[PDB]
Enzyme design. Structure first.
Site, short mmCIF file in Angstrom:
data_model
loop_
_atom_site.label_atom_id
_atom_site.label_comp_id
_atom_site.label_asym_id
_atom_site.label_seq_id
_atom_site.Cartn_x
_atom_site.Cartn_y
_atom_site.Cartn_z
N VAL A 1 17.33 25.12 32.72
CA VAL A 1 15.95 24.98 32.22
C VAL A 1 14.94 25.22 33.35
O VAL A 1 13.87 25.80 33.15
CB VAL A 1 15.68 23.56 31.62
N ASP B 1 22.39 16.82 32.26
CA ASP B 1 21.80 15.48 32.21
C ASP B 1 22.20 14.79 30.92
O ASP B 1 22.61 13.64 30.92
CB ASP B 1 20.29 15.55 32.34
N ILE C 1 31.67 19.25 33.84
CA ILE C 1 31.58 18.26 34.95
C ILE C 1 31.95 16.81 34.55
O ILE C 1 32.45 16.04 35.34
CB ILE C 1 30.21 18.26 35.61
N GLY D 1 21.13 19.45 29.05
CA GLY D 1 21.84 20.26 30.00
C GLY D 1 22.93 19.33 30.47
O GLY D 1 23.48 18.57 29.69
N1 LIG Z 1 28.43 20.17 31.25
C1 LIG Z 1 28.05 20.95 32.30
N2 LIG Z 1 28.88 21.00 33.39
C2 LIG Z 1 28.57 21.76 34.48
N3 LIG Z 1 27.43 22.51 34.59
C3 LIG Z 1 26.55 22.53 33.58
C4 LIG Z 1 26.78 21.75 32.34
N4 LIG Z 1 25.71 22.00 31.54
C5 LIG Z 1 24.87 22.87 32.20
N5 LIG Z 1 25.41 23.16 33.40
C6 LIG Z 1 24.90 24.01 34.46
O1 LIG Z 1 23.97 23.22 35.14
C7 LIG Z 1 22.98 24.08 35.68
C8 LIG Z 1 21.70 23.26 35.59
O2 LIG Z 1 21.19 23.35 34.28
P1 LIG Z 1 20.40 22.16 33.57
O3 LIG Z 1 21.45 21.20 33.07
O4 LIG Z 1 19.43 22.70 32.53
O5 LIG Z 1 19.56 21.51 34.77
P2 LIG Z 1 18.49 22.20 35.75
O6 LIG Z 1 18.29 23.68 35.51
O7 LIG Z 1 18.77 21.72 37.15
O8 LIG Z 1 17.18 21.42 35.31
C9 LIG Z 1 16.52 20.71 36.35
C10 LIG Z 1 15.11 20.52 35.86
O9 LIG Z 1 15.09 20.56 34.43
C11 LIG Z 1 14.99 19.25 33.89
O10 LIG Z 1 16.26 18.75 33.46
C12 LIG Z 1 14.44 18.41 35.03
O11 LIG Z 1 13.09 18.05 34.67
C13 LIG Z 1 14.61 19.19 36.35
O12 LIG Z 1 13.48 19.40 37.22
C14 LIG Z 1 23.09 25.43 34.93
O13 LIG Z 1 23.35 26.52 35.85
C15 LIG Z 1 24.24 25.27 33.93
O14 LIG Z 1 25.24 26.32 33.86
#
Ligand SMILES: Nc1ncnc2c1ncn2[C@@H]1O[C@H](COP(=O)(O)OP(=O)(O)OC[C@H]2O[C@@H](O)[C@H](O)[C@@H]2O)[C@@H](O)[C@H]1O
EC number: 3.1.1.106
Length: 172
Positions: free
Chosen positions: A123, A33, A10, A31
């Site tokens: 996560v 973030d 992304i 992730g």
């Molecule tokens: N560079 C990237 N580009 C695109 N998608 C990504 C990338 N890295 C991870 N992902 C995708 O983003 C999705 C979300 O994963 P995370 O990054 O771990 O975030 P998320 O699961 O939404 O976590 C949200 C929760 O966790 C904490 O970060 C926070 O406290 C929040 O409530 C996953 O399905 C994963 O494949």
């Protein structure tokens, strides 16, 4: 024509707005973030602090928008997806709201293009399949009712997920 599925990172996408799957603090994590903050550089964190300082914790289901620093985007929309807990804690709604308020913020800031990761499916442990359903249904119904944003990109980190979306998309 208006909604696209793309496989990759992304942070590499040249769109008006890139959406971050953030946590209430807004401060950083891992992730997407972490990837986003890394890519953006320190300006993003400065900005997230200023925001935090001004509205405190970003509640679940809501979103905020900031500059993007070194990213090829113009701005970053930080949205707080729900943490998955079995599906009896109004999670499906909160996830919906995350997508919605993100979109509204994009529009409110006169932005034409936005890229979404797969919010809450890492996560936070949202069942990959139900999530995509909501993501696609919500975004689709929204762009139907609104001129802005013009373009939407669903960014998927792997091929498995990408195909998921792809199908859910052409399944309507
Ligand atoms: N560079 C990237 N580009 C695109 N998608 C990504 C990338 N890295 C991870 N992902 C995708 O983003 C999705 C979300 O994963 P995370 O990054 O771990 O975030 P998320 O699961 O939404 O976590 C949200 C929760 O966790 C904490 O970060 C926070 O406290 C929040 O409530 C996953 O399905 C994963 O494949």
């Amino acid at each position: 024509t208006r909604i696209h599925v793309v496989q990759g990172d992304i942070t590499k996408l040249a769109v008006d707005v890139i959406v971050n799957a953030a946590n209430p603090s807004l401060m950083g994590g891992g992730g997407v973030d972490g990837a986003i903050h890394r890519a953006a550089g320190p300006a993003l964190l400065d900005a997230c602090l200023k925001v935090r300082q001004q509205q405190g914790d970003c509640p679940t289901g809501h979103a905020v928008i900031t500059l993007a620093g070194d990213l090829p985007a113009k701005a970053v929309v930080h949205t707080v997806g729900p943490v998955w807990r079995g599906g009896e804690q109004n999670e499906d709604q909160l996830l919906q709201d995350a997508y919605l308020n993100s979109l509204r913020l994009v529009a409110a800031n006169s932005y034409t293009s936005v890229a979404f990761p797969a919010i809450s499916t890492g996560v936070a442990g949202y069942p990959r399949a139900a999530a995509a359903e909501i993501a696609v249904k919500t975004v689709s119904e929204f762009i139907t009712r609104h001129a802005l944003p013009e373009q939407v990109y669903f960014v998927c980190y792997d091929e498995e997920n990408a195909h998921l979306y792809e199908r859910l998309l052409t399944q309507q």
